[PDB]
Amino acid sequence: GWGYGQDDGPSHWHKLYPIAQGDRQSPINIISSQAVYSPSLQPLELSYEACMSLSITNNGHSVQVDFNDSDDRTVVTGGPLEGPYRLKQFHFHWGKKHDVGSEHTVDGKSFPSELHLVHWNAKKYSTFGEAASAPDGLAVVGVFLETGDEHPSMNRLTDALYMVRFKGTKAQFSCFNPKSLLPASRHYWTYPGSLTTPPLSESVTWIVLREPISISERQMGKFRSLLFTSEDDERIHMVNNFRPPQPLKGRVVKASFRA
Ligand SMILES: NS(=O)(=O)c1ccc(OP(=O)(O)c2ccccc2)cc1
Ligand SMILES: [Zn+2]
């Protein structure tokens, strides 16, 4: 019952999921001058192995790469987190045109796309779904994408999109190391927030990396060639699959660096 169309888009989600109007909703506009430098935070480490990826799937709302999460070999730790969170999946949000598509914004600025690497507290909860209901359940690392030079590692993923263009299709996607989609800086902003798609549960520690990665226009275009629709429907391109900034409601944004 939800999507990114004119009738079922983010402005209407609250009609189905009242938490849409809650006190810790994501994404947000990060006002860099208002972020609080927090030097006691631990260094953020993304400890990712090369061959933990399973498949790539067009689920109707994004393209998502799922991971074997049955041990603690692909984890985020440090920064604001009290212990390791295992990577379950990553996916993207992007725009129709070149200058929108990210969910978080910085000082009002959007990026063409935003990557989400989605991690759960498996040491505490027995399932991703269970963790996704609890305030300390999830840790999502957000990476902005800008267009510029072609990203070599990205080719593997953008070349894979043809076969998952229609909603509900998937392909095997082995030995894709998500470390290859990270910037050379580990500086970040962190705040307590929510899933940015229903059920919009306020269960996420957001870690938005300060530095964007760059992919080419051709690469960005491959994402725009995905469809929201299945093989036998009128084609509707999967674009503008992002939720806009939500009210801060007096939450504190911390930063690992001085702006
Ligand atoms: N876009 S975001 O904030 O990174 C996000 C949103 C929803 C998520 O959960 P989800 O994959 O929709 C799910 C929920 C409950 C049970 C199974 C799966 C994960 C990340
Ligand atoms: Zn997301």
Numbering used by the authors: 4 to 262
Paper text:
CA VII is deemed a brain-associated CA isozyme as it is predominantly expressed in the CNS while missing in most other systems. To understand the molecular basis responsible for the inhibition efficiency of phosphonate/phosphonamidate benzenesulfonamides against CA II and CA VII, the crystal structure of these two isoforms was solved in adduct with phenylphosphonic acid 3. This compound based on the ChemAxon software has a pKa value of 1.62 and, therefore, is assumed to bind the enzyme at physiological pH and in crystallization conditions in a deprotonated, nonchiral form. Crystals of the CA adducts with 3 were obtained by soaking experiments as previously reported for other sulfonamide CA inhibitors. Data were collected to resolution values of 1.26 and 1.94 Å for CA II/3 and CA VII/3 complexes, respectively. The electron density maps were very well defined for both proteins and for the entire inhibitor in the case of CA VII/3. In detail, in both structures, the benzenesulfonamide moiety binds the active site in the same conformation adopted in other CA/benzenesulfonamide complexes, coordinating the catalytic zinc ion, forming two hydrogen bonds with residue Thr199, and establishing many hydrophobic interactions with residues located on the bottom of the cavity. The phosphonate group points toward the hydrophilic region of the active site13 and forms in both structures several water-mediated hydrogen bonds with enzyme residues. Finally, the phenyl tail is oriented toward the hydrophobic side of the active site13 establishing many hydrophobic interactions with residues delimiting this region and interacting with residue Phe131 as hypothesized in the design. The comparable number and nature of the interactions established by the inhibitor in the two active sites might explain the similarity of the inhibition constants against the two isoforms.
